[PDB]
Amino acid sequence: ENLYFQGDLIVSMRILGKKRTKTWHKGTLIAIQTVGPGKKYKVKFDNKGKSLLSGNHIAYDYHPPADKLYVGSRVVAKYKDGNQVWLYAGIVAETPNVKNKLRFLIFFDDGYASYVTQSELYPICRPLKKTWEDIEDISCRDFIEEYVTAYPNRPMVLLKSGQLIKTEWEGTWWKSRVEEVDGSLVRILFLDDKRCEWIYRGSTRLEPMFSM
């Protein structure tokens, strides 16, 4: 059937949708379609054509109130890529608190992590019951399932600036150094390549956590 209303969605509303590039973009909800128990959502993008999307591939174009976000919530967040910024899907790993200077910690679908503000987050419209089950990368999906279901039990390595450790990249271990710690994240300098990355302190990419 062709619907005009479905839960709190209404045809003609503004929405964000996932493009095939896996970045998220503004558009208009132009149709809602049913087939049995399934539902699809037709989106016309502002600077593009159309896509027919499942409900976990659309998001509201507003920022959610804090009491509606949990560890495990499925979201779209601001994502820094060189000197460019995108909207990219992720999972909430921490809500605002004193130790993290009142920020949200985001685990993104591709394995990167960052702290963002409430104004940098959007909630996905119809998340899966197990919110991580639409993460395509098996290693990332399995890490987030264990993290979300174990929370608040969070094994982490205690790290200090200057400390020498081994960090994983492309399947092997590299000599690296702790440059900075910010809440549950650490900035790692890869010594041979002289480039830095922010990594979660419970990540199995840190050799002490891999040990365990």
Side-chain angles (χ1 to χ4, degrees), residues 1-25 27-34 36-39 41 43 45-46 49 51-67 69-77 79 81-98 100 102-135 137 139-165 167-169 171-174 176-191 193-194 196-210:
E1 314 181 55
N2 303 305
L3 307 187
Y4 218 84
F5 304 91
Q6 193 290 291
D8 66 356
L9 297 171
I10 308 179
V11 166
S12 79
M13 68 186 10
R14 296 289 283 165
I15 202 146
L16 298 168
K18 194 175 178 183
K19 288 192 173 192
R20 287 171 71 102
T21 51
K22 317 295 178 181
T23 57
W24 295 66
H25 299 272
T28 302
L29 179 65
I30 63 170
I32 306 168
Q33 296 172 9
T34 73
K39 301 182 177 38
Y41 303 89
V43 172
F45 290 100
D46 287 353
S51 303
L52 188 66
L53 299 166
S54 51
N56 57 317
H57 286 163
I58 47 166
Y60 298 105
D61 191 28
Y62 57 69
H63 312 298
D67 61 22
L69 297 167
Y70 304 81
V71 172
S73 288
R74 197 77 165 101
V75 294
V76 172
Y79 178 110
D81 185 341
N83 59 25
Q84 298 198 285
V85 303
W86 301 94
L87 291 188
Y88 207 76
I91 300 268
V92 171
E94 305 183 342
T95 51
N97 67 47
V98 169
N100 66 27
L102 300 167
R103 291 170 295 161
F104 295 82
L105 183 59
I106 307 301
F107 291 168
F108 287 105
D109 283 16
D110 65 349
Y112 289 100
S114 71
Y115 281 115
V116 302
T117 65
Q118 189 202 15
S119 53
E120 294 174 328
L121 281 185
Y122 307 86
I124 275 152
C125 297
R126 306 279 180 270
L128 293 184
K129 166 177 191 161
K130 301 185 186 179
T131 47
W132 52 86
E133 275 188 345
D134 58 6
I135 291 170
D137 180 305
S139 292
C140 287
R141 178 175 82 247
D142 285 351
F143 184 94
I144 291 158
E145 174 180 31
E146 172 71 27
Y147 177 95
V148 174
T149 54
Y151 187 93
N153 191 354
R154 290 201 298 166
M156 284 189 220
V157 55
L158 294 163
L159 293 175
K160 302 297 180 190
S161 295
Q163 219 178 316
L164 301 180
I165 59 118
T167 309
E168 183 273 344
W169 187 72
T172 59
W173 293 112
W174 301 80
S176 68
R177 192 173 72 209
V178 171
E179 297 305 282
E180 203 193 336
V181 177
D182 177 21
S184 303
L185 299 181
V186 55
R187 185 163 52 88
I188 295 297
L189 169 71
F190 291 83
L191 289 171
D193 179 77
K194 294 169 180 180
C196 284
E197 182 180 11
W198 288 97
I199 295 174
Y200 170 61
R201 289 195 291 110
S203 168
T204 48
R205 301 178 57 202
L206 302 172
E207 192 270 333
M209 284 308 307
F210 196 98

